[PDB]
């Protein structure tokens, strides 16, 4: 029951958006994190639209191939639902309670705390401790999304042959792979105010956290799709193209004229605007360091022009910068897609809570 | 279910129980870095802890008692360490097919064919390793096993200064994990290293690779050895001979105790180390790891490395670390030498 006797355990990082599957393995010897393997696929068009996947098939397909460049033999995960899916409430329970007692009171009275039609709710729950209010009853904490949610990535997991483990919240994954970064900046959290601002495909989203821990966040229906959108048309070029125009390079003179710096400023425009809603909602009047995450973090010199912009300091997120590698890890195909591992990163975290 | 983790969130104490002392350390964890929290030692009433062996267990609790005050932490969940000789590891081949609880039962009826306890008496932790080479229709289970009143004592120990025992350890799982910070020093990766650790009744030699135990040898010589010299010379208490070894004694005592004495440490050192090279594929030791309170004797570590032609180093596994306010980084450094099974103890929280 408690025997220790036995000294043991890591779990594969799997981040789904709506464009791609980023695999990420870690290990930890002492103190410091190593990786393992590592591997992205591009998903099938439609195949997740937003937050929700719908071609189970396509998911499914993605996923064994990126087991297959990963080269990994794990074969359990940590996946994560949008926070914008999961309700959180506190309420009061009775104190002196087992687990089952726990568990029945809950299941039952769940409709009566959560939105949620009761036979569609997965619902999580923890003790917080004795209520200060009356300390006959305890506070416990709860925390529930829409089933389905759950049972679509077990599903697409399973098809690749891999089981979900733990499924997370994408903002907790942010989190421990923020907590990493410490390094690079201050180091330490030193009550670090710092805006993380992930810049997806299709989604942007700005989290802002305090000392390590999670506060404002909101998103943007802004992303990298945008000037892919943009490269195509100029260009008359296909969507996979588009995104390879982006890395590779090879496009005309009057790209970086035409269309690229016309999106740089773009995400200025989106990053600012984000960042006065913060400062608005808040006590805090500045943030110590703004972090850019997401694969569109990695356009040339994007750091410098928000630097410039809004006059704060930001650099592009690499929780890996201090992490021992695997022979078989690329060092520059990593470091070049660093910051769209921050989920991914966070999610293989979840191993060592 | 309890796939679950739409909910976020839990550190234990690190509680080593000696023959003559109880420390207590407590650790917490940004990201990678870690930081002491607190950290106390209290001195443990003689003959309440003998050998490896709790007998006076009130008198525990009340050492407890006192360590909690001093290293002025809110936990109250602990890791405790069981000896390592206590402790009987084995794999064997069991049926597949069976749930978790379903295995834990049919452990007990097999216990008793290949576990040397009593059946009434016996503690085992157990793990499926996978299917088993032999037979793919068996899976292959490692036992660790230890008789229930190690763990019962502790338990019934901690209760009464209000803790309880969240993990009970190993020592030697313990020592790797603490030693594991250590390399951060020597760099970077522990890679064959020997470990001593100099207790007040007791030493103890141990070896590692790439951050793994090999082997793992013991005798009664400690500092007690030094301090009852001590009090015969100048007929002083152990309390008294204890404290004069740190505090520092008549002139006499450098010549004809003191130097002596770490004659007989060296000597001890030699004939335990001879063996690991003698029993195994490995020729050379990289270093000599000096642990326990006795090993911050000025100049000990240098007097062993040049008569054994090794490098001596004494262990400080919080070099690295940052510390919390209330903790002394003058205090803890002179005691960190003793802590590193304390501190192993607190990293379980993080495993
Ligand atoms: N080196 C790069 N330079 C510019 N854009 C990039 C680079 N790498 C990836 N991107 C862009 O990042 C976008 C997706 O990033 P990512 O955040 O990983 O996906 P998601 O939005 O699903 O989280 C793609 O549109 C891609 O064009
Ligand atoms: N600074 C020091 N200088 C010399 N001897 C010390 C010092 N600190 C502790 N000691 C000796 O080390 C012994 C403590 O051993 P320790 O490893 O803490 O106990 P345990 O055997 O329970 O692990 C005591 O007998 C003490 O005499
Ligand atoms: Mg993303
Ligand atoms: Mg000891």
Redesign the interface.
Known sequence: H???????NTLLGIDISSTSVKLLELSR?????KVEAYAVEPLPPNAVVEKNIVELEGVGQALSRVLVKAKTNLKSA?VA?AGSA?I?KTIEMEAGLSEDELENQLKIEADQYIPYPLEEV?????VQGLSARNPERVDV?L???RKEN?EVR?AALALAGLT??????EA?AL??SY?????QLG???DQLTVAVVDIGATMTTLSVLHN?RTIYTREQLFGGRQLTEEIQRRYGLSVEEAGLAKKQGGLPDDYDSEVLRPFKDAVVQQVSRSLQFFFAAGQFNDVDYIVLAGGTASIQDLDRLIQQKIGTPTLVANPFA?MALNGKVNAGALASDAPALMIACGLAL?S??
């Open positions: 408690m025997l220790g006797l036995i000294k043991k010897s002492g103190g410091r994190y940590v639902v999961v959180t997965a619902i999580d729950f923890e904490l925390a529930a999304c759950v077990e979900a483990k733990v499924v997370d919240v907790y989190e421990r907590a990493l970064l410490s390094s180091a330490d959290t390590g201090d979840r060592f809570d």
